RNA sequence: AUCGAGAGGCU
């Protein structure tokens, strides 16, 4: 995103872009798409080096003025305590990976464990392709019945995954039973 | 540090004691030092005691040393086990490395010594010194696919 | 290192493994493919002949059968092509390739092999499915786990090497590990937890639970014993019913903190006789501890007593479990409301403590205390107290936590988990570390982006205030992840560094075998060790005993062990022995005990002079605690009558008793001082123990109960000799390496660095110190 | 890739339910749990047969041959 | 691959008898019986039915390896008191309690409508 | 395999009636140890069971997107709303015999994933098979019908236990045993030897 | 199969650890395991 | 009326009924849960011989979809086991013949419903072997989709089994099971936070079983023999004969230990 | 094959503990102001009140395998509300003339103090307890 | 070397029957039964010659000589009666 | 026969 002066501080993109960006997407007109925010000026393309010169925000309510009696539930975040801000991330999920992408609550795991299943996800079996029974390779290996999984990451949505899923929700008990 | 020590009364008691902790290595003369007592300081570079109070103390304080590795998972190895070890790299003059440098250059015969590092190079030093092999060794009958001189065929057995 | 060292074999066979409550230890579970598979050739005999041609009947391709025969022409016969395959004319002398049948031995091993007790014989049950099936309390020897393991086995094709397999590498055998000397195996973390939830003196079972669980046990004699509670309803205790398991004979003494002969909270352990008198079972008492229920069983009734045993326990307990029940969740997670706010109070307070220690540090005021500067200082003072807060906070949580709470119970019963694991888990998960520091300046003076520059507030260097449960906030979640990264690129290095280290060792101890002299030589006859472990004893049957000796007052020494026949106040009460009356005086008895007295105060003088430390416990090669409870238990004391043992008795008998441990036998002064040499820390413990006051005021032994108790300690001792041909060297090797490779991760090189420092000397060591006294 | 006939768990058939489903969904406008527990799919033993099931057939259709 | 065919756990099979019968030994009067092709469904049943007769000491099954379809049925009974006739009047008062049910939910649905 | 690094190989099949089961009949797919939980902290394995339970029953998305505002409160009103205890545990009996487990039992739906490692395709065997022409050996790789390597690091183990004739038997009749004719003036084997 | 498209190797204990830099153009965890880990990385 | 177990239906219905079992053992129910699921037998495809397949699924994964086809079961105790008939491989009193054949003739998709299912055996009168459909459309389960130009053409075979052998010979719809709302029994101990009765909630069930005092303290000897259950049936067999035909296998099968208690 | 010691005790001290079902219990001897003891007790079977009154009793009997009641033909030994069986494990020589003995019924402990009891009390693997109402 | 042998008087090795000597010899002698050779003990109904070789040693009657042989070339020779088993 | 890559396993 792109944060500037308004007024105070403020990113660039208002609900009016949002909702042009939501009508060019639900036409499936003037449309709206990505190359038009690069080209209009409400977004960069930072780099690593470049990145060493800015300050950037976690979420857009960063930018929102605060002058308590809070659900105990939630985590607990720092306060801001800074306001020179330059740029807000998309949002923080979008710096996993493809196939981290796909585990539900990594923000709560060890993240060996993260890393064990980022590994693993390679090797589940699934549907592959949906041309399955034309392609002729060496080896693959289909699901009979593929169900998409019932927690599901926002990613989950631009990854496919719920499209050609690659496991089943199991009806599992964590039992001592047997010693088995 | 805390040490336990005999109390007058006999039973043993903790007496706390000051003791110094350096990052440098020069036995030889902080031995020398008035103030201290130059029969219980220690320094964990085995190899200058080795060099100064005899290879027999070098023992001890390389086990120290590696009881203390050990010690630090909570762990524990018998004591025979190590003192196998250290006594191995020990018995000869002084410390004898575990690795080519050290015991592979031995009179333990040439195959023995053959598999485990410059294979090829200890054979010709071998072929050229003309190394008679015990063939004694657990490696030479291993290689031969004879039955090693091993527990089970430590001995012979024959007939009343 | 690929074709002569080690090579690639027939008879062998591979897959996956998995566990099976209901068999025994030392068996096997193999698949019937891979018996169909396997052969070893047995020869004809008149005792199996019918048994040859049955199997021969049934075919190489249905087991049992077999695959090939061989005549004495040497020409093969293939059972599956063969015109003659029903019809056969068994000769005496030929050979038949029998299919692996059950109770065969098998070498059965894990790869990597570390441990002796990683290639371990294994008696044969073939079973339909496709694993490699294998008892629960024999995972420890192979570090196995079923997530996709893989397992090996191999076949004898002679009748010697069954032997060696039989004798030598049995499981059973194997339970003592040399290395530790401890028990390597012991009971897993389902049957542990089970065995804690039923042997509670809240937990009783009803007749028909009982019934079916007294079943279970195979080996048993088939009588109900009373149950505890009669009048109301008939009931059991956990206790109770598990005493059954426990073989008639077996006493076991241990006391944890507050445990009075009340036993208020059932904390430690006193079974007599194959009965559980108190305490609730756990890990001390069953898991692979030194001192644990397998030790003793393993000395004292034999290696199949003990293997029996196993599963003895484990059928008992899986049933009842199976019937009661046991799960996680997240509610096991949870602590209430006033736990959090107080934790969350906890975390402010290290916050505003820390915010203060660094105003302090910007005002230049701080003491560069000697050896050390100031940001040094500084970040010490702030992962203190991070750490500080992190277990606080998770103490704050292990107290709230209930008693059903099913992970505190996991932890008590020692199953699997910890305290850092509940503190992570639920309270908070502390600081993040790479390289020993905080979270590094990987961009130009600060962290990451999202900060100002020069930040060094403690979420700006990755402190995970929350906690797992609560959920982890991006930036806090990236430094975790970058610690992650860490430990697994340590693990990744130390494994390969751990597997060069170990191959060097046994590479170099390979030849260490102790000979019949006990001269611990190699190849070259090079002598190493002229007593193997400097007192010839292998290093299993040695045990944890005290010396009663170092320590303690001289006060309570003399009124524990001065007996004075010339004092009326010092002698023993005739109240201790029956010729009491008429032993005052007799000077040809108190110079006797004024020998065996100056003998005791020297070598009290003696060990005292060799533990600076003074402490009491350590390795000796036979326990006498469980012998004077055997006789306690055998001969059926009454504590109440007199002994009758002149002094003359006790003290010639100790003192002739040494003339005959022996561990060498030379007729030549040299092998009798070495031998003096090796028993001497042994007659010390025995002058301890077997002290003239002690054997008639704390133990009350009788004559013949004496003289058992002395050919028992003889026998032990020349039991707990080690054996000759022992390769010592490289199972040294495996006993050092191991452990490394289990070396997980305060200011010098330790662990594997330290370990690769020492082994190749290293002239240049990272932290050369020296401690001045 | 087509829908299960009964729940693995139980063994209610779910077959007979799908077009129903989708139709109970788009021509009645309903939401997922209306739909769910109109079928006497109470239990999520079967629930989960429908509501997480994914329709390849129709895109394994398209291929000509 | 290796599985044992299905049918494999109430097909008794060459000379496979349904019951075997052994003395126990260190026990008078006590007896063990090997159902064949049977799971803990009848061995359950069988032991709570045993446990409601007087004159028995003592009856326990045990189902040896969940592999396998069988199991083992221990029976102590009184002196004089075979226990196969305890197995025989706990079969026939389970089969006259069953018979009974059978005609109550009968007669029970016969009266419900819908 | 679940999402979370919790691999796992099937040791036993059980059938519906020796499963346990809840009041409402339903029986687990799957029976995981609890004790192989605390050991690795991966609660979002329980957090997705019960995240999971919530949509089947409510007929919604299980929104499992990392930094959302996921209360686990929140999630327990909703599992109340529904009537389930809120912390996915239920009342249990055994499938033996129909004793309620005294213990209840966490259960739920949760996403299992089947993975490319399977056994009738790993298991292996030989007994004399096809040798190599080189080193007259067994071949390697149980595609070839190849034997298993009896590494050193195993001989090591081996000989720790001091079984000398069983070494000998894996290292000569097991494979590429040979016998060969040597001279006694000198020690080579370069002899004519003309058996027959 | 995206995982595989989008691989990153590294031909050379200092690299392999997660770098500062890494966010938002690297996974954190998505990574090989035992032997040449943390070289190989995924966008 | 007849002494000994007595039952009550609280409701009944075509394809479940929730009743009480009042004055009976627990393993007696137990061991008849565990019959109604695994031992009742029942009719349901076990060979196809399939001549054309040009769907776009795997043959069998075809096979596999119609083992799970529900057939009418009503009458099968006049069939036998095809293991124990004489015939050389199915006689026509030991299974029955299925046929199936769709063609993609339709533009639009043509589905495969279970009722396009056609029978070749002779039937013998008896109720045996209609694929049920409760579907409202009458159409039954969807087993495959066929594009225009693909054809499917086989031939089922359904022997007599139980749910044993496999599970698609199950009247197997759950079985629900409860016992002792209040937990007088004291059979299990309820995990709670603060406290352990807001926090669990109550069964419907608690209306018919009266709650304890506060003051009554433990019924040691009370035993349960009051249960609460509900079976569901697929349709293979009507509810009312699911738990009869149960109850007959299992002192079928006691009398199996009878006949060969005798024979000893 | 008789009663071994009889008395009667006024509970001193009742406590939960962490154990739900089991309390211990404390009492002393009623007008004999020396000799006390500790037990443990199943609540739920048999209630305990504080500042009860308790009839205490211990038995010889009244080896081979247990059997349930056949009948009321066994003829029991017991009126009582509470039995259970013990086995001695510690004789402790408190003081001159002053004796304690520990018992444990399958678990639940008891220990008694008292020195009128001597020449009856031994080290017997049999030991019944029992209480009146 | 030129006849190094040892007095049965002047003996030092163990008289205990080494798990190692005692394994070798069952072997060896499992394999004297294993083809048909003559076997010393009424064989109280087994088969396996392992145990017939172990009962052979109980009652002692198993006719072989371990020759312990000394790192300097010297040996001891010990007949099985004379060697213990514990 | 060579070489390369990917993957499995070790709280
Ligand atoms: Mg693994
Ligand atoms: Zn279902
Ligand atoms: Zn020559
Ligand atoms: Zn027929």
């Given at each position: 995103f792109?944060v ?6 403020e990113?660039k ?8 960006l939501?009508?060019?997407?639900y036409?499936?007109?003037e449309?709206?798409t ?5 080209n209009?000026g ?7 080096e ?18 308590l009696?809070?659900?105990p ?14 740029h807000?991330?998309i949002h923080?999920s979008?710096?996993?990976?493809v ?11 060890q993240?060996?464990?993260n ?13 592959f ?17 593929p169900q998409?999984?019932?927690?599901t ?21 964590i039992?001592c039973?047997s010693?088995y | ?17 000051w ?18 007592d130059?029969?219980r300081?220690?320094?964990?570079s ?6 100064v109070?005899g290879?027999?103390?070098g ?6 040393e590696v009881?203390?590795?050990?010690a ?9 086990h ?14 004898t ?8 250059r031995?009179?333990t ?6 598999s485990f590092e410059?294979?090829v ?5 071998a072929?050229?010194?003309?190394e008679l092999?015990?063939?004694?060794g657990?490696?030479?009958?291993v ?8 527990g ?7 007939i009343? | ?13 591979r ?29 004809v005999?008149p005792?199996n ?7 021969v009947?049934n075919?190489?391709?249905?087991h049992?059968g077999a ?9 093969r016969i293939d059972?599956?092509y ?5 019809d056969?004319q ?9 299919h692996?049948?059950?109770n065969?031995?098998?070498?059965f091993?894990r ?19 496709s ?10 020897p ?8 893989e ?18 590498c ?5 339970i003592?590990?040399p290395?530790s000397?401890?028990?390597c ?16 003196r809240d937990?009783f ?16 004699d ?6 505890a509670?009669?009048?109301?309803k ?6 109770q ?5 426990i073989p008639?004979?077996?006493?076991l ?22 009965q559980?008198?108190?305490?609730v079972?756990?890990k001390?008492?069953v898991?692979?501890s030194n ?11 034999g290696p199949?007593?003990?293997?029996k ?7 008992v ?7 009661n029940?046991?799960?996680?969740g ?12 107080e934790?969350?109070?906890?975390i402010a307070?290290?916050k505003?403590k820390?915010?203060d ?16 500067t ?5 970040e ?32 008590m ?13 639920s ?13 590094a300046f990987?961009?130009?003076d600060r962290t990451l982006?999202?900060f100002?520059?020069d930040d060094?507030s403690?979420?700006?260097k ?13 930036q ?5 992840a ?12 130390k ?6 280290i170990?191959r ?13 002299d ?7 006859g ?9 007192d010839?004893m292998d290093?299993a ?9 170092i320590?303690?007052?001289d006060?309570?020494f ?15 009460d005739?109240s201790?022995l ?11 008895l108190?110079?006797?005990?004024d020998?065996?007295?100056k ?13 600076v ?13 469980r ?18 043992l002149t002094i003359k ?6 003192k002739?008793?040494?003339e005959?441990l022996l561990?060498?036998?030379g007729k ?17 413990l ?12 704390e133990?009350?032994?009788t004559?013949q109960?004496?003289?058992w ?5 003889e026998?032990?001792?020349?039991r707990?000799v ?8 490289v199972?040294?090797?495996?006993s ?8 997980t ?7 594997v660095?330290?370990l ?8 240049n060591?990272?932290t050369?110190?020296?401690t001045?006294? | 890739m ?6 693995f ?11 129903s489903?989708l139709?109970?969904?788009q ?14 799919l ?6 989960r ?8 057939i129709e ?7 | 691959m290796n599985?044992?065919?299905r ?6 099979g060459?000379g496979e008898?349904?019951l ?8 008078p009067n ?8 049977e799971?803990?469904?009848?061995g359950?049943?069988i ?5 409601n007769?007087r004159?028995?000491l003592?009856?326990?099954?045990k ?11 221990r029976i102590?009974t009184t ?6 006739d305890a ?9 006259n ?5 059978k005609?109550?939910?009968?007669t029970?649905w016969?009266?419900?409508?819908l | 395999?679940?999402?979370?690094g ?13 499963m ?6 339903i029986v687990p ?8 939980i ?13 995240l ?14 990392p ?7 929140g ?5 109340r ?9 239920e ?25 490319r ?6 298991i292996?065997a ?7 022409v080189?080193t ?7 595609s ?7 590494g050193?690091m195993?001989?090591?183990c081996?000989?720790?236990?001091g079984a000398?004739s069983?070494?000998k038997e ?25 058996l027959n | 199969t995206?995982?595989?498209l989008?691989?990153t ?6 690299p392999?650890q ?9 996974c ?7 032997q040449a880990?943390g070289?190989?990385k995924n966008? | ?16 009924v929730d009743?009480?079992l ?14 109604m699921?695994?031992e ?8 196809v011989?399939v ?14 979809r119609?083992?799970?086809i ?13 293991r ?5 491989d199915?006689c026509?009193?030991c299974?029955?013949?299925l046929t199936l ?6 533009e ?8 396009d299912?056609?029978?070749?055996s002779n ?5 045996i072997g209609?694929?049920?459909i ?19 053409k086989?031939?089922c075979?359904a ?17 629900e099971?409860?016992?002792?709302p209040?937990?007088?029994l ?11 009765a ?23 000897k009370?035993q349960?023999d009051?249960?609460?259950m509900?079976?569901?049936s ?6 009312d ?17 009878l ?6 | 094959?008789?009663?071994?010691f ?9 406590d939960?503990?962490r ?19 500790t037990?443990?007790?199943?609540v739920?079977?048999?209630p305990?009140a504080?500042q ?7 038995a ?9 009641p ?7 030994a017991?009126?009582?509300?509470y039995?259970?069986?013990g ?8 003081s001159?003339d ?5 018992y444990?019924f399958?678990?639940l402990?008891m220990?008694?103090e008292?020195?009128?009891?001597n ?15 | 070397?030129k006849?190094?042998a040892?007095?049965?008087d ?5 008289p ?5 000597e005692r ?5 060896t002698?499992?394999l ?27 009652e ?5 000589v371990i020759?312990?042989?000394l790192?300097?070339?010297?040996f001891?020779?010990?007949?099985v009666?004379?060697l213990?088993?514990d």
């Amino acid at each position: 995103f792109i944060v500037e002066d308004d007024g105070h501080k403020e990113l660039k993109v208002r609900k009016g872009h949002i909702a042009k960006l939501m009508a060019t997407e639900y036409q499936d007109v003037e449309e709206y798409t990505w190359s038009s925010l690069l080209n209009e000026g409400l977004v960069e393309y930072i780099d690593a080096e470049e990145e060493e010169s800015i300050l950037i925000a976690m979420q857009p309510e960063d930018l929102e003025p605060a002058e308590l009696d809070v659900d105990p539930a939630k985590r607990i975040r720092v306060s801001h305590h800074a306001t020179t801000f330059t740029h807000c991330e998309i949002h923080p999920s979008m710096i996993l990976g493809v196939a981290a992408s796909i585990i539900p609550f990594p923000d709560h795991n060890q993240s060996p464990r993260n890393t064990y299943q980022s590994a693993m996800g390679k090797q589940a079996m699934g549907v592959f392709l949906t041309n399955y029974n034309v392609r002729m390779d060496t080896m693959a290996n289909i699901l009979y019945y593929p169900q998409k999984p019932l927690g599901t990451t926002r990613a989950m949505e631009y990854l496919k995954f719920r499209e050609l899923p690659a496991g089943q929700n199991a009806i599992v008990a964590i039992a001592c039973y047997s010693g088995y | 540090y805390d040490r336990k020590v005999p109390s007058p009364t006999g039973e043993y008691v903790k007496e706390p004691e000051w003791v110094l902790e350096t990052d440098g290595v020069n036995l030889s003369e902080v031995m020398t030092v008035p103030g201290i007592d130059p029969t219980r300081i220690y320094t964990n570079s085995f190899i200058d005691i080795m060099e100064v109070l005899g290879i027999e103390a070098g023992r001890a304080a390389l086990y120290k040393e590696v009881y203390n590795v050990i010690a630090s998972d909570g762990s524990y190895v018998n004591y025979r086990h190590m003192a196998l070890l250290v006594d191995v790299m020990t018995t000869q003059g002084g410390l004898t490395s575990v690795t080519r440098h050290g015991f592979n250059r031995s009179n333990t015969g040439a195959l023995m010594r053959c598999s485990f590092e410059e294979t090829v190079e200890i054979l010709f030093e071998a072929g050229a010194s003309a190394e008679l092999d015990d063939c004694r060794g657990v490696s030479e009958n291993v290689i031969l696919g004879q039955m090693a001189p091993i527990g089970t065929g430590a001995f012979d057995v024959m007939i009343d | 290192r690929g074709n002569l060292m080690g090579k690639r074999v027939d008879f062998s066979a591979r897959t996956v493994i998995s566990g099976d409550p209901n068999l025994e230890l030392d068996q096997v579970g193999v698949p019937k493919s891979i018996a169909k598979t396997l052969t070893y050739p047995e020869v004809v005999t008149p005792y199996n002949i019918d048994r040859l041609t049955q199997l021969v009947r049934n075919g190489p391709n249905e087991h049992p059968g077999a695959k090939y025969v061989i005549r004495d022409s040497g020409d093969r016969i293939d059972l599956r092509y063969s015109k003659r395959a029903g019809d056969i004319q068994l000769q005496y002398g030929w050979k038949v390739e029998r299919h692996i049948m059950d109770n065969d031995p098998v070498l059965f091993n894990r790869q990597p092999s570390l441990h002796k007790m990683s290639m371990m014989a294994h008696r044969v049950k073939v079973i339909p499915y496709s694993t490699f099936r294998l008892n629960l309390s024999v995972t420890s020897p192979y570090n196995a786990d079923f997530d996709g393991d893989e397992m090996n086995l191999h076949v004898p094709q002679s009748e010697e090497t069954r032997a060696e397999l039989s004798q030598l590498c049995a499981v059973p055998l194997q339970i003592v590990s040399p290395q530790s000397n401890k028990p390597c195996m012991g009971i897993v973390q389902d049957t542990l937890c089970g065995i804690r939830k039923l042997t509670l003196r809240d937990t009783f079972i009803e007749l028909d639970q009982v019934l079916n669980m007294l079943y279970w046990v195979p080996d048993w004699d088939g009588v109900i014993p009373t149950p505890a509670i009669i009048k109301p309803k008939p009931l059991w205790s956990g206790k109770q019913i598990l005493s059954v398991a426990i073989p008639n004979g077996i006493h076991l003494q241990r006391f944890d903190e507050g445990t009075t002969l009340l036993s208020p909270k059932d904390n430690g352990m006193l079974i007599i006789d194959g009965q559980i008198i108190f305490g609730v079972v756990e890990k001390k008492t069953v898991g692979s501890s030194n001192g644990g229920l397998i030790h003793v069983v393993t000395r004292e009734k034999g290696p199949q007593v003990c293997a029996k045993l196993f599963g003895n326990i484990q059928k008992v307990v899986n049933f009842w479990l199976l019937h009661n029940g046991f799960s996680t969740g997240i509610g096991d997670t949870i602590a209430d409301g006033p736990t959090m706010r107080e934790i969350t109070e906890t975390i402010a307070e290290a916050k505003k403590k820390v915010l203060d220690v660094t105003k302090e540090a910007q005002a230049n005021l701080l003491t560069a205390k000697h050896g050390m500067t100031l940001r040094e200082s500084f970040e010490d003072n702030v992962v203190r107290f991070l750490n500080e807060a992190r277990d606080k906070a998770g103490r704050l949580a292990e107290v709230n936590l209930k008693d059903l709470n099913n992970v505190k119970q996991m932890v008590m019963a020692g199953s699997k988990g910890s305290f850092i694991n509940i503190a992570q888990m639920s309270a908070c998960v502390g600081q993040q570390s790479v390289e020993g520091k905080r979270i590094a300046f990987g961009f130009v003076d600060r962290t990451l982006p999202h900060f100002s520059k020069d930040d060094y507030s403690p979420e700006s260097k990755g402190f995970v205030e929350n906690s797992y449960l609560r959920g982890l906030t991006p930036q806090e979640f990236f430094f975790h992840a970058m610690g992650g990264r860490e430990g697994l690129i340590d693990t990744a290095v130390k494994t390969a560094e751990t597997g060069y280290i170990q191959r060097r060792l046994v590479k170099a101890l390979e030849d260490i075998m102790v000979h019949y002299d006990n001269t611990t030589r190699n190849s070259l006859g090079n002598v190493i060790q002229f007593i193997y472990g400097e007192d010839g004893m292998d290093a299993a049957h040695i045990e944890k005993q005290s010396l009663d000796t170092i320590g303690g007052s001289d006060a309570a020494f003399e009124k524990r062990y001065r007996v004075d026949l010339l004092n009326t106040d010092h002698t023993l009460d005739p109240s201790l022995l029956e010729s009491g009356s008429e032993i005052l005086g007799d000077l040809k008895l108190q110079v006797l005990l004024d020998e065996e007295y100056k003998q005791l105060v020297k070598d009290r003088k003696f060990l005292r002079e060799v533990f600076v430390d003074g402490e009491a416990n350590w390795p000796l090669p036979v326990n006498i605690r469980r012998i004077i409870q055997n006789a306690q238990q055998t001969f059926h004391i009454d504590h109440t009558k007199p002994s009758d043992l002149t002094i003359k008795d006790i003290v010639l008998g100790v003192k002739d008793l040494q003339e005959n441990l022996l561990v060498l036998r030379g007729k030549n002064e040299i092998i009798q001082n070495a031998q003096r040499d090796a028993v001497t820390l042994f007659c010390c413990l025995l002058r301890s123990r077997l002290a003239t006051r002690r054997v008639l005021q704390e133990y009350r032994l009788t004559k013949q109960a004496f003289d058992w108790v002395l050919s028992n300690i003889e026998a032990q001792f020349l039991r707990s000799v080690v054996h000759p041909g022992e390769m010592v060297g490289v199972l040294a090797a495996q006993s050092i390496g191991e452990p490394a490779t289990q070396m997980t991760l305060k200011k010098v090189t330790s662990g594997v660095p330290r370990l690769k420092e020492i082994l190749n000397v290293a002239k240049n060591m990272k932290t050369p110190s020296l401690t001045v006294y | 890739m087509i829908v299960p006939v009964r729940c693995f768990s139980c063994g209610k058939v779910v077959g007979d339910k799908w077009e129903s489903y989708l139709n109970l969904l788009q021509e009645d406008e309903l939401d997922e749990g209306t739909a769910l527990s109109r079928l006497g799919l109470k239990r999520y033993c079967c629930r989960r047969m429908i509501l997480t099931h994914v329709d390849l057939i129709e895109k394994f259709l398209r291929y000509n041959p | 691959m290796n599985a044992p065919d299905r049918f494999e756990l109430f097909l008794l099979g060459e000379g496979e008898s349904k019951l075997k019968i052994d003395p126990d030994t260190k026990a008078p009067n006590a007896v063990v019986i090997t159902f064949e092709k049977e799971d803990h469904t009848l061995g359950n049943l069988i032991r709570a039915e045993l446990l409601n007769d007087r004159k028995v000491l003592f009856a326990a099954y045990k189902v040896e390896h969940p592999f396998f379809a069988r199991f083992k049925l221990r029976i102590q009974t009184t002196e004089g008191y075979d226990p196969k006739d305890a197995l025989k009047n706990a079969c026939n008062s389970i089969i006259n309690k069953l018979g009974a049910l059978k005609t109550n939910f009968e007669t029970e649905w016969n009266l419900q409508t819908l | 395999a679940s999402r979370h690094g919790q691999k796992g190989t099937i040791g036993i099949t059980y059938r519906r009636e020796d499963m346990p089961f809840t009041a409402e009949g339903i029986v687990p797919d799957l029976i995981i140890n609890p004790h192989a939980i605390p050991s690795r902290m991966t609660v979002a394995h329980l957090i997705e069971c019960l995240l999971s339970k919530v949509a089947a029953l409510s007929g919604n998305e299980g929104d499992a997107s990392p930094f959302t505002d996921i209360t686990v409160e929140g999630i327990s009103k909703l599992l109340r709303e529904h009537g389930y205890q809120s912390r996915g545990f239920e009342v249990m009996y055994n499938g033996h015999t129909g004793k309620k487990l005294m213990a209840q039992i966490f259960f739920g739906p949760t996403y299992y994933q089947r993975l490319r490692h399977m056994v009738d395709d790993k298991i292996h065997a030989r007994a004399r098979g096809p040798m190599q022409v080189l080193t007259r050996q067994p071949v390697e790789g149980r595609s070839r019908d190849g034997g298993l390597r009896f590494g050193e690091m195993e001989r090591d183990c081996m000989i720790a236990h001091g079984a000398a004739s069983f070494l000998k038997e894996r290292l000569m009749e097991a494979s590429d045993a040979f016998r060969v004719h040597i001279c006694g003036i000198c020690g080579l084997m370069t002899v004519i030897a003309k058996l027959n | 199969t995206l995982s595989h498209l989008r691989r990153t190797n590294t031909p050379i204990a200092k690299p392999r650890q997660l770098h500062n830099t890494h966010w938002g153009l690297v996974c954190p965890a998505e990574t090989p395991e035992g032997q040449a880990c943390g070289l190989v990385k995924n966008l | 009326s007849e002494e000994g177990p007595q039952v009550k239906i609280r409701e009944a219905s075509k394809d479940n009924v929730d009743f009480i079992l009042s004055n009976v053992d627990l393993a007696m129910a137990n061991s008849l849960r565990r019959v109604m699921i695994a031992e009742i037998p029942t009719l349901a495809i076990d060979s196809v011989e399939v001549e054309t397949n040009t769907t776009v699924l795997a043959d069998e994964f075809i096979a596999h979809r119609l083992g799970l086809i529900p057939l009418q079961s009503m009458d099968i105790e006049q069939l036998e086991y095809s293991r124990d008939c004489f015939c050389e491989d199915h006689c026509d009193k030991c299974s029955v013949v299925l046929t199936l054949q769709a063609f993609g003739e339709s533009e639009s998709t043509t589905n495969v419903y279970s009722k396009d299912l056609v029978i070749v055996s002779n039937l013998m009168g008896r109720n045996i072997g209609h694929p049920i459909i409760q579907d409202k459309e009458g159409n039954g389960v969807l087993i495959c989709k066929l594009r225009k130009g693909q054809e499917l053409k086989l031939t089922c075979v359904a022997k007599k089994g139980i749910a044993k052998e496999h599970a698609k010979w199950g009247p197997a719809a759950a079985i629900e099971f409860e016992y002792d709302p209040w937990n007088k029994l004291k059979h299990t101990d309820y995990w709670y936070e603060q406290d352990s009765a807001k926090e669990w909630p109550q069964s419907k069930n608690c209306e018919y079983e009266d709650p304890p005092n506060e003051g009554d303290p433990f019924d040691y000897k009370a035993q349960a023999d009051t249960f609460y259950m509900n079976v569901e049936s697929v349709g293979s067999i009507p509810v009312d004969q699911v738990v009869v035909r149960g109850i007959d296998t299992l002192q079928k099968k006691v009398a199996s230990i009878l006949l060969a208690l005798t024979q000893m | 094959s008789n009663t071994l010691f009889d008395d009667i005790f006024q509970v001193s001290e009742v406590d939960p503990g962490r154990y739900n079902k089991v309390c211990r219990i404390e009492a002393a001897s009623t007008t004999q102001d020396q000799c006390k003891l500790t037990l443990d007790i199943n609540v739920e079977l048999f209630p305990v009140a504080a500042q009860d009154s308790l009839t205490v009793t211990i038995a010889s009997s009244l080896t081979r395998s247990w059997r349930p009641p056949q009948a009321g033909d066994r003829s029991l030994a017991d009126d009582y509300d509470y039995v259970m069986y013990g086995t001695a494990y510690k004789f402790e020589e408190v003081s001159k003339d002053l004796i304690a003995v520990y018992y444990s019924f399958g678990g639940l402990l008891m220990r008694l103090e008292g020195n009128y009891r001597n020449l009856n009390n031994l080290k017997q693997e049999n030991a019944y307890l029992l209480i009146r109402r | 070397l030129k006849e190094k042998a040892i007095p049965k008087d002047q003996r030092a090795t163990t008289p205990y029957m080494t798990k190692y000597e005692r394994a070798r010899i069952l072997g060896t002698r499992a394999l004297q039964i294993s083809m048909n050779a003559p076997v010393f003990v009424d064989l109280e109904g087994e088969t396996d010659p392992l145990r017939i070789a172990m009962k052979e040693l109980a009652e002692k009657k198993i006719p072989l000589v371990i020759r312990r042989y000394l790192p300097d070339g010297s040996f001891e020779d010990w007949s099985v009666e004379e060697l213990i088993v514990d």
